[PDB]
């Protein structure tokens, strides 16, 4: 008997894959000061980012 031929389904799938985004990451220092007055026993939110 004959041998089956391939399907194109894999190459069609590959054409549909979007490229990854190029992000442009960088490193920097984000130093900040904070000054306050508070009393004991409370949870004080001193840092927020």
């Amino acid at each position: 008997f004959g041998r089956k031929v391939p399907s194109n389904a894999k190459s069609q799938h590959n054409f549909s894959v979007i490229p990854s985004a190029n992000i442009q990451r960088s490193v920097f220092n984000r130093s900040s000061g904070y000054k306050t007055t508070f009393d004991a026993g409370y949870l004080i939110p001193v840092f927020l980012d």
């Binding site: 549909s16 894959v17 979007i18 990854s20």
Partner: peptide, 10 residues
């Protein structure tokens, strides 16, 4: 198996 166009559908 990569990031497909139109979002994911298996």
């Amino acid at each position: 198996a990569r990031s497909m166009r139109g979002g994911i559908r298996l």
